[PDB]
Amino acid sequence: VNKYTYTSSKAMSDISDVIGEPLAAWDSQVGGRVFNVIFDGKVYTNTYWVERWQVPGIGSSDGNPHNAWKFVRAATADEINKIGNPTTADVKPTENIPSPILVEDKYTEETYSRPDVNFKEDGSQGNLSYTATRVCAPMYNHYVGDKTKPKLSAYITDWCQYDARLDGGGSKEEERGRGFDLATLMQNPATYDRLIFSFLGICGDIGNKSKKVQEVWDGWNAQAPSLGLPQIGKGHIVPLDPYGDLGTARNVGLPPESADTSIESGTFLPYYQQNRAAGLLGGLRELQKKAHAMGHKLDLAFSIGGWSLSSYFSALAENPDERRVFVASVVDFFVRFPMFSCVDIDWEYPGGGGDEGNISSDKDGENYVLLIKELRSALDSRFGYSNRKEISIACSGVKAKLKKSNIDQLVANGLDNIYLMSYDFFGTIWADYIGHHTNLYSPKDPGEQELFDLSAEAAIDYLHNELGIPMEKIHLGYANYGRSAVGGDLTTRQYTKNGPALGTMENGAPEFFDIVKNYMDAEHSLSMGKNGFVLMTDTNADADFLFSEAKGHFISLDTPRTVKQKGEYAAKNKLGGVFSWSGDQDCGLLANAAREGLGYVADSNQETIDMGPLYNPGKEIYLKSISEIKS
Amino acid sequence: LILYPVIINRDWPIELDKTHQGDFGTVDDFTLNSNYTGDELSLYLQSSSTYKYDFSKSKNIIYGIWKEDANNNRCWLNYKLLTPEDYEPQINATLVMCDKGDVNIITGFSLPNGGVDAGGKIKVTLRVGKKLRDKFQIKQFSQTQY
């Protein structure tokens, strides 16, 4: 564990029981040692870790993100003379850089140079960047066992796979794609307690991508007779791309040995098992092996359904036997990959919502409850209690449709956990006004917090108070991308609708790591807006954001400080658990901060990198709520 | 130097002549994923010609891949009798023969009869039973061999 010492002295005659400490002016104090520094004639002790932006002045009953930088005013004028009393200051980014942060990518520079991309730091010549995640550094400190705190998790997805810039590419967005090697986390495993691969699917799904469903169903049905195995209809679960999952070596922390990447949908099927599992999923299995080599086993998991593949949920509803066959395929998958700690479902619309392709009825929620109970039953019928699985679903926070979800009966039917989608509240391309797509906290004037100012706390209170559900059964997290909006006016939150907005790959969805590259910095031990792009924070909702005047472009985003705020709240609550959505694109600094928000403590005096200076607030402002502005 | 036994390179069989003879285009219409698995051949191909056709005649045109020796038989079933909208059809096959002959496989588009064979055609001889070097050698230094 980390350890630190200090000392104090007195005359041989005088022994204070208290830690005597040199009386001095405040100036950029930091750390754990006692400080009684003086400022504005007052005398101030931060009885908590000290940070170079923390200020005792405001600190009199403030000065740390949680409590009073307490004070006395014992100092006399001649003390205020022998020590030149401070009365104001401003911490600056230091001149040096205590730690490297990232490395350039040849191909990303080439990308910017591409005559279609034409990307520029200001985005003037190019609104998108398609920046390779390879730019990133490992960036993970190390931490104590800290067993009591709620579990930590992260989401993971297939977009880890490819960027043909590694192969030259140069003509199309995926040639300018994204991806990273899990070797990263392998370097220091146990970075999380649980993981969730992206929602996969089933035969018969309805959405745009369904040609993939067709192809794989074909491959399966072709293989099945040759394997001497029964054919499958709709509702059977799909692996989507076994070639990615297993027919891989790059980005999956494993030598190219045995990577028969040639194998695919028409041929993988024998390999569709953990023992045989090459590529990504296998790599995960070995990662867990390493993890256990340490101890503290990860809950390896995934789910199915989700934003873009939910379409068949209604269709499968009220087809009980097909639903049975589907969950049969579920448990079969468990048998094929008993490695998994559990897996879950990503139904998203008891009442219709999201993409319209998710056809839906009213009864959907009820039927969903029913089938859910039936699933639970099937699982229990399958599993041995010594190895039991316990299921979770997310929730959308749609104040009404969440009610329509009948969480009460789901709990009564052994659905153990809930993960609140805490992000993208700001449907920036269509939303009426700019807002924080992920605000936990209620801004002032809750009069309009119905399709806006969607403080997750409101739903939280619904479940806790208005539904009695223990926090244990509910989980929350954060995502590693902000929103970006054209022409926004900070006073009115009005903004240029439809106008194309910043993303490396996804317009309107600025990507955290590349934001670290382009717009924000910390190399000088601080939270540092850079390249002329405004660093900013709102007092109304504890909101945090970024701006650029030349295109009135705004970005709402979580931050180290803001996810810290989040984790601290969740921790003070003792929520069921903490996680991060879209974990695929943070260096890990936000994870270190998340540990901090969890109160999860580091285990050594050494660091991968610092984190304290990342919690200075941005340019302070008060932003009126939508209701306040309209009123 | 001296060498080793003859050894099967247990991977994708290698190149041999394509014998391109398509009606409406060059060999470059074709694409071929030559490969192998578990002691048996596997390969996947596509010929980008369908959209050109006057499906009034070219409807249900035989599209696929089939081995043909001097018999030039049609003992295969991967023939995609293309719809007038099969603008980019994928044909996919595997084979299992002990004789590691560099067998010719006619592939692409053909009608069941009549000279009309709208689109790309090729008679690709594959090559199989390939090997690899292992380069180890004497050297001379002055008069003294090493």
Curated annotation (Swiss-Prot), chain A:
Optimum pH is 5.0, in the intact toxin complex optimum pH is pH 4.0 to pH 8.0. GO terms for cellular component: extracellular region. It holds the Pfam family Glyco_hydro_18. Chitin binds at Q274, N275, G305, G306, W307, S308, Y349, M421, S422, Y423, D424, W581. Its EC number is 3.2.1.14. The active site is at E348. It is found in: Secreted. GO terms for biological process: chitin catabolic process; polysaccharide catabolic process. Disruption phenotype: Cells with a disrupted yenA1-yenA2-chi2-yenB-yenC1-yenC2 locus are no longer pathogenic in C.zealandica larvae. It catalyses: Random endo-hydrolysis of N-acetyl-beta-D-glucosaminide (1->4)-beta-linkages in chitin and chitodextrins. GO terms for molecular function: chitin binding; endochitinase activity. Signal peptide: none annotated. PANTHER family: CHITINASE, CHITINASE 12-RELATED. Part of an orally active toxin complex (TC) with strong insecticidal effects on larvae of the Coleoptera Costelytra zealandica, Acrossidius tasmania and Adoryphorus couloni and some Lepidoptera larvae. The TC has an endochitinase activity. This subunit might aid infection by degradation of the larval peritrophic membrane. This is Chitinase 2. It comes from Yersinia entomophaga. The gene is chi2.
Swiss-Prot record, chain B:
It is found in: Secreted. Disruption phenotype: Cells with a disrupted yenA1-yenA2-chi2-yenB-yenC1-yenC2 locus are no longer pathogenic in C.zealandica larvae. The isolated toxin complex includes 3 peptides starting between residues 768 and 778 of this protein, which might be physiologically relevant. It comes from the Bacteria. Semipurified toxin complex consists of at least YenA1-YenA2-YenB-YenC1-YenC2-Chi1-Chi2. The Yen-TC:K9 subcomplex is about 26 nm tall and 22 nm in diameter with 5-fold symmetry and 5 copies of YenA1, YenA2, Chi1 and Chi2; the chitinase subunits may be solvent accessible on the exterior the complex. The Yen-TC:K9 subcomplex has no insecticidal activity. The native complex with additional YenB, YenC1 and YenC2 subunits is 16 nm taller and is insecticidal; the toxicity-conferring subunits are present at about 1 copy each. Part of an orally active toxin complex (TC) with strong insecticidal effects on larvae of the Coleoptera Costelytra zealandica, Acrossidius tasmania and Adoryphorus couloni and some Lepidoptera larvae. The TC has an endochitinase activity. This is Toxin subunit YenA2. The lineage of its organism: Bacteria, Pseudomonadati, Pseudomonadota, Gammaproteobacteria, Enterobacterales. The chain holds residues 391 to 536 of 1364 of the full protein.
